[PDB]
Amino acid sequence: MALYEEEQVERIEERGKILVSLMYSTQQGGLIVGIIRCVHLAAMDANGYSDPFVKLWLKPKKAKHKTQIKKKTLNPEFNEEFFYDIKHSDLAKKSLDISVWDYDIGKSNDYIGGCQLGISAKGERLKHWYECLKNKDKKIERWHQLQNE
Numbered sequence: 001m002a003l004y005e006e007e008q009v010e011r012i013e014e015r016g017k018i019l020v021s022l023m024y025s026t027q028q029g030g031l032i033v034g035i036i037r038c039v040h041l042a043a044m045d046a047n048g049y050s051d052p053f054v055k056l057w058l059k060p061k062k063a064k065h066k067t068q069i070k071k072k073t074l075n076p077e078f079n080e081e082f083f084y085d086i087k088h089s090d091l092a093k094k095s096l097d098i099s100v101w102d103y104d105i106g107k108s109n110d111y112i113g114g115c116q117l118g119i120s121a122k123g124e125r126l127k128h129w130y131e132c133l134k135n136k137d138k139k140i141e142r143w144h145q146l147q148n149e
């Protein structure tokens, strides 16, 4: 069996959920995004696990970030924080795309799921974003369900 065959799952959830923190820091003049952990991720490898990592894109180089890769887990702890230099008055114009990926070494990475937070989001995604906006210097966390895009 080839390396890449260990890394495939077809199929064919249940993609899991992610704990995100948001804080606008007036002292620092920017948004601090925390990727804390995920739970119950979908398995995208034949061992019944995944090698998760998380990418951030603030829309619309400096716009992107990505965590380290966790090996062989459906419940990764990341505890990473990322910073965007942006006036508070401009933060409502943006959308934060968050996507979780299964790293593979002999093929394309596998998509697990994502969420997008922003004023143009719906439900709990919007709520979390507005809350950060309406409450400076306060760390606001929230679980989000990972969706298909």
Ligand SMILES: [Ca+2]
Pocket: 007, 008, 009, 044, 045, 102, 103, 104, 109, 110
């Ligand atoms: Ca895979």
Ligand SMILES: [Ca+2]
Pocket: 007, 044, 045, 050, 051, 102, 103, 104, 105
């Ligand atoms: Ca993998």
